[PDB]
UniProtKB/TrEMBL annotation:
<protein>
    <submittedName>
        <fullName>DUF3826 domain-containing protein</fullName>
    </submittedName>
</protein>
Length: 444
């Protein structure tokens, strides 16, 4: 019954099936429309445009479409971290109106650094971090580099576990902090060991560490806890405390050569690190950078850092590092497809404010997909070789050992070495962020 008096109301699932048949498209559904009723459904249709029709029937339920290949469309929930290339181009054009030189750029960059840090809440948690003796494994020797595991206590009872990759070559070394993306196996994976081992053979101390609720963090908080705003703050805190610990505990580091490098989520965390800490002298965010995507995981976008200074994006945060050497690796199979046309020229103009366009580079892999495969690693090897004066003759992944996973563990094959004091539920961490969690906890 289509009447004025029943608001010409149709179930949304009938409307969309009807759009699919009428305009001859295919729909992939990543939403469940059960029970959804759209008033005036047929009046929202536009015979000349499948896209207006879809947007007019979906935006009332907070849904959208994303055009796939050919005549296929995916139907999605609104995503606060994800916009379009078009949104990107308007954002970056808008931010270009806020600065015409170094002076104007540098005032906004300082506001961006302060408001990002404030909005992350990291200084609240740093004021509560302890100073206990880090748990260090024995040093394991390999061809031209060694590996040593660490567990560093942050908040009372909370541990970040990682591994340090040290060159065997004599003399002062570069240091590279290496947050990782959501790739299978985390920092334990083959391509992560390859990259840390090659950079260490070439003369860089390299450090990698568990994402919150990955690896041995699972022993304390479980796997679910990773997708939380807590993860965003805790992972940035982890990076900073690890940089502090490396610089205070080691004699072999040249403080003119401190790098950040990571892939996907690790590339988002790389930009966060160079935004939070002025000690970094070079940066390589890999298959990560976009004006129009902030990161899909709450560990990347869970805190509202992109609302800093009236609105920013990871491309502008990356720009605040100017004019320090920075490599952006992009590919044609993900959100970084835009970088050669959009994000890179934006970064070139800002590096331009310092006569240092040559300090920022883009290795675009048009044919490749979202991974940390060999040509991603080769752009990283090449960049740090160049800017940190590392030894390219040592570059050979066949010489890196692929340790089994448990060899990088701090707390034993089965986590049986997990300290007495140690947090064993997410509740203990959540209580720093949410009064509901604190209240659950305080009723023993
Ligand atoms: Zn994450």
């Amino acid at each position: 019954t289509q009447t004025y008096e029943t608001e010409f109301a149709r179930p949304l699932n009938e409307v969309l099936t009807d759009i699919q048949n009428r305009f001859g498209i295919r729909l992939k559904y990543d939403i469940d429309t059960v029970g959804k009723i759209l008033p005036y459904a047929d009046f929202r249709i536009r015979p000349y445009s499948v896209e207006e029709s879809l947007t007019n029937v979906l935006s009332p339920f907070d849904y959208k479409f994303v055009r796939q290949s050919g005549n296929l469309y995916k139907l999605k929930a609104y995503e606060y971290p994800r916009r379009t290339d078009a949104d990107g181009e308007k954002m970056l054009a808008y931010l270009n109106t806020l600065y015409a030189d170094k002076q104007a750029f540098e005032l906004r960059a300082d506001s961006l650094r302060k408001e990002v840090r404030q909005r992350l809440g990291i200084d609240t948690l740093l004021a509560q971090c302890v100073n206990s003796t880090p748990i260090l494994s024995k040093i394991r020797k390999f061809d031209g580099y060694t590996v040593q595991n660490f567990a560093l206590e942050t908040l009372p009872g909370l541990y970040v576990c990682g591994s340090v990759y040290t060159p065997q070559s004599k003399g002062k070394h570069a240091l590279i902090i290496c947050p990782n993306g959501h790739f299978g196996g985390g920092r334990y994976r083959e391509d992560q060991q390859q990259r840390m081992g090659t950079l260490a053979r070439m003369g860089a101390v390299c450090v990698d560490y568990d994402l919150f609720g990955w690896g041995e963090s699972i022993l304390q908080v479980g796997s679910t806890a990773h997708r939380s705003s807590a993860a965003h703050t805790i992972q940035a805190m982890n990076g900073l405390l690890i940089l502090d610990y490396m610089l205070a505990s080691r004699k072999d580091i040249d403080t003119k050569r401190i790098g950040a490098n990571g892939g996907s989520g690790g590339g988002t965390h790389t930009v966060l690190l160079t935004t939070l800490d002025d000690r970094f002298t070079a940066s390589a965010p890999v298959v990560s950078l976009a004006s129009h995507f902030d990161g899909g995981c709450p560990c990347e976008s869970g805190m509202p850092i992109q609302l800093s200074a009236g609105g920013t994006c990871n491309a502008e945060l990356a720009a605040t590092f100017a004019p320090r050497p920075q490599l952006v690796v992009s590919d044609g199979g993900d959100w970084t497809a835009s970088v050669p046309a959009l994000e890179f020229p934006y970064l070139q103009r800002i590096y331009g404010f310092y006569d240092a366009k040559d300090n920022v580079t883009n290795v675009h892999l048009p044919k490749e997909k979202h991974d940390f495969g060999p040509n991603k690693r080769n752009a990283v090897y090449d960049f740090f070789a160049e800017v940190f004066d590392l030894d390219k003759k040592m570059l050979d992944e066949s010489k890196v050992t692929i340790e089994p996973e448990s060899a990088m563990y701090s707390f034993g094959e089965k986590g049986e070495l997990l300290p007495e004091n140690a947090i064993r539920s997410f509740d203990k961490v959540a209580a720093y962020f949410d009064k509901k969690a604190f209240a659950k906890l305080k009723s023993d």
